[PDB]
From a paper:
Here we report the crystal structure of the catalytic core of S. cerevisiae Pol ε with a P301R substitution, orthologous to P286R in human Pol ε. The Pol2CORE-P301R was stable during the purification, gave a similar yield as the wild-type Pol2CORE, and crystallized readily in the presence of DNA and an incoming nucleotide. There were no rearrangements of the N-terminal, exonuclease, finger, palm, thumb or P-domains, nor were there any alterations in the interactions with DNA and the incoming nucleotide in the ternary complex of Pol2CORE-P301R. All considered, this suggests that the capacity of Pol2CORE-P301R to synthesize DNA should not be compromised. The overall crystal structure of the exonuclease domain of Pol2CORE-P301R is very similar to the wild-type structure. The P301R substitution is located in a loop, called the Exo-loop, but does not affect the overall conformation of the Exo-loop. In the Pol2CORE-P301R structure, the R301 points toward the catalytic site, forming an ion pair with E292. The R301-E292 ion pair interaction is buttressed by a water molecule that is stabilized by the backbone amide group of T293. In contrast to the wild-type, the P301R structure harbors only a Ca2+ ion in the A-site, coordinated by water molecules and three catalytic residues D290, E292 and D477. Interestingly, we observe a steric clash between the terminal residue of the ssDNA and R301, suggesting that R301 will interfere with the binding of ssDNA to the exonuclease site.
Author numbering: 31 to 90, 111 to 224, 233 to 662, 676 to 713, 721 to 1185
Write the structure that this text describes.
Amino acid sequence: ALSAQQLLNASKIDDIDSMMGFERYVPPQYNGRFDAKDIDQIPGRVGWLTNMHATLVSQENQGISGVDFYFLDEEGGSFKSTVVYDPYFFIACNDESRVNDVEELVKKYLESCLKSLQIIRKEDLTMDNHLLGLQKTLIKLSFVNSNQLFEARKLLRPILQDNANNNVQRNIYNVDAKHLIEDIREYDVPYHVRVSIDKDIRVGKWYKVTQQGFIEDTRKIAFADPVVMAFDIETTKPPLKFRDSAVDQIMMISYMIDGEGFLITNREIISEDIEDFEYTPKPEYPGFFTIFNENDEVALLQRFFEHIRDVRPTVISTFNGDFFDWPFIHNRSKIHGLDMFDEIGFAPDAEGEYKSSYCSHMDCFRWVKRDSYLPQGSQGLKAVTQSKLGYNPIELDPELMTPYAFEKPQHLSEYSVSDAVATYYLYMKYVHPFIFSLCTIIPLNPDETLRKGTGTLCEMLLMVQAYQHNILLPNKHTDPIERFYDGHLLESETYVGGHVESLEAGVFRSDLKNEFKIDPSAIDELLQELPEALKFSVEVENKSSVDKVTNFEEIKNQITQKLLELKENNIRNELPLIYHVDVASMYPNIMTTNRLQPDSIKAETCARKLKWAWRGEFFPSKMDEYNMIKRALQNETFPNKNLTFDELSYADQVIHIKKRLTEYSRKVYHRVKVSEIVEREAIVCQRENPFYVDTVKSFRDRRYEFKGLAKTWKGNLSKIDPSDKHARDEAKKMIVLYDSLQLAHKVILNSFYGYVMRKGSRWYSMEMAGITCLTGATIIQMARALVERVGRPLELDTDGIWCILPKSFPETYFFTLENGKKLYLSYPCSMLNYRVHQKFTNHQYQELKDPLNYIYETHSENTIFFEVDGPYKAMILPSSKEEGKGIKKRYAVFNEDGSLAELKGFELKRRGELQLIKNFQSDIFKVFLEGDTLEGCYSAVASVCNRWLDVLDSHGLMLEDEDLVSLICENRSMSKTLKEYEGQKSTSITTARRLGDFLGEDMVKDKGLQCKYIISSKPFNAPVTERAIPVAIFSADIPIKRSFLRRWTLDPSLEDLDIRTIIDWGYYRERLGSAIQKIITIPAALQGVSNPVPRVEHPDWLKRKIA
DNA sequence: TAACCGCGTTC
DNA sequence: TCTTGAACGCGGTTA
Ligand SMILES: Nc1ncnc2c1ncn2[C@H]1C[C@H](O)[C@@H](COP(=O)(O)OP(=O)(O)OP(=O)(O)O)O1
Ligand SMILES: [Ca+2]
Ligand SMILES: [Ca+2]
Ligand SMILES: [Fe+3]
């Protein structure tokens, strides 16, 4: 059966591997002792491991399961080696005394597919006295291949389903071996993952392949250098529509191979032949490019494959090439009678992504999506190049790409080549090191380490730990179909996450004094503290001792004097210090501090009870109204899906049930969802097997290593003499390099926290998550309470606070120790950190000291620390249009040298908002730095405001036509296709429908469409979603333009098709206006400054308050 | 007005 | 099949 498909594929894969330089190396035999102490002596071939794939092998009966491993050797070559390993899962019993009798049943029940049984023991974290050494007994079923593993699962699931059902009825007037199978375990482990965990093999490491197995050569340091190729394809595009592989033909393919690289053109569309040129967008990224101009498009495709076959690439990189480039090449090869798989060994997979056996396909867009830490608006290759490589790549409008084949062809070749070098160097500088390093710790292959979710990455790491501590894997979590609370059906439950406050809007600059009120008891509190806080700063914050530091007293005194001056001069009008405090890796450090772990929460010291906040959303329907709505739906007739209500799937029954319960409650209450929050407590055992905390602690330290290096090189740039341009160039590049790495790790890191609530998680715990958050809320609010009493907090988000402090507040001091060095001290930082460590430290942390006698020690752990960045030059916080409301998660901060430090939330960064507001915000925030007074500052920003206002009061006359197209467009995206939005009205939704009638259904075929639209004045007083014109229409033929423009404005006889007359300038004027009141005018009000843009009227509530 | 939704950010 | 979390701003509709 289905075996045949698999052994066939393995045969084909083997042939391609052979062709591309990957023969199966079988190592010599060896009958001597096999330890890694004696590596050079054992017969074998040492290689660097690049890939991993599951394969089936013949007797070299029904197929044997194994993994092919792809190595690069030290003699400039390549080989492949094969490990076989029997797939296995476990059967668990609800009575240990009778485990043997289950074997005699499953040995006969699964005679059809099982190779061997065995009785094994594992630690089960859900078992009593497991921390005393008691272990759970299990039956290890092993198999010859993975299909036979699957068969046994199909045979076991009825037994497991039946066992969960009540036994039948024979003699009512007063156990079976089957009824003792409690569950199956570790049945859903991907096979090749099972091999890399059990065999501790990882891609990126050096091994010598020998008869006894793989031997890691810890003596080889640096990775081998695989031959990496990146490629870009550009194709013809019929105007305003999209590129279709059926009709459109490939124009040219640009690529690079280890620095060199090439262009190949289809001269049947490229209006001439081409000369060898060079595009070196900066010296770091050379690019001398030969060309092969070819006659036919099939000559082009054959040239590409022929080149690939000759160079033998272990890595092929692209940019979104997974879903555009590779499928386009395949259909074009198919049309032209070329089978891609026989040519370069590539083919789509079950998710429709293109893979090969010998060569990993590295789609940089997957890196950019997961690990670049870039906003979505900055996730196109243009912005990625500017951000990560530091240069501006060649821009060329698509609509011109097909025409410029004939008109300006050498220019187009200069574009296609830009995308090529930008992705090769993006891969080599960022994707290649990070991904391949990750493979050395995560048991997946490059293609998987690149593409899988960060929660899955965590899961992989955690499974290694669980396995190597002999801990039995929990089965994947399963959310119930219905959960209830006080007799109400629950629509959603969750915990209360981060705590964030908007406290104050306006402008704050270091050269413009503000007024502070200082709580005198607060400074009296700090004074009865800083003796032990400065000791804290040396003994805990710098791992030193006061015994070896000299000027302890002198520093203790400077600060005290300053504090005293502030205690008598409570009221002051001084120049501010703009600071930011942030806990380093707050949630990770919170989990490790508290030994937080899904396996650590229980019911029924050894007990650290911590509180969390549960919040449910339910219907106010009581059960009586639910049971009523159900049987009502039971009697009705329902369409099939290729029947009765009870013949539908239980899932669909609740789908219908939810809809009917939604409408019924709105009648009886009009209140459809009720939201309640409950304080809850959970116990957190302090002695549980800490395999989870430790996995987090390790990955944190791993990340901290790169965040530390960034701080190191940010310093090394303070001492770079501004003349030596080459020194500061390399320093600035190292920093971009280590900020990237540290941020790439950050998402994976905090995914250890989110994993606890991920669907299908093996370590689910709503409790642990809520505890993590509520504690974070408590720490951040304790920190705000102090700064409030000693300064003005501006904004606060979960773990960070932007605050303003007098200039007379103690900031930075430098101890001097006997070794001559120095120790940094930010008093505002260690001020909070000492209170953190007085009020949140875990004194109940326990750990195995003597494992043989199960003896535990108790100590105190706390790894929660604020860090400061600052002082900054300016901060600009917007305000809400409503009264008494602020705006969170939006602001602009400026560094001393006038550069932009942080720019949060605003539309300029978000993906495809209204370009007008984007350009306005880009032009506005730098201007807040000008002026000599606060009143003078707001005037400068007022001038640029009115300039933009004049643009719109003039009905857009100052802009040439090529410039107005951009300023008024709003380009928003559609997560799904149009058919999936039925019953919904939005501006994207009508823009897509109209783009569909006008250009064909072929346009909203795919998901993720960029709807570039314009709001029209007509029809008048119609809802704004009705008057949404696709910007594309203004570029079609006047026949088409007029018919639809008349349709979409319901003005059936209209002749003024000029774009300027269609636009609803009052709409855009209202939108720019809202921007100006939120960023400029209403902030100017709460700071005590009359309106600086009088053409934007204050709201009626603020016109009421000024009085 | 208040509830509610899709998107895309800040944590 | 694969799949980190919650809090939030803002257009815009709906009750
Ligand atoms: N992608 C994310 N997934 C889950 N939680 C996140 C994510 N991003 C931020 N957080 C959560 C966990 C964080 O500990 C917490 C605070 O975020 P944040 O201050 O930006 O970074 P961090 O404190 O975790 O690292 P850093 O040292 O860079 O400050 O919010
Ligand atoms: Ca391209
Ligand atoms: Ca932080
Ligand atoms: Fe306990």
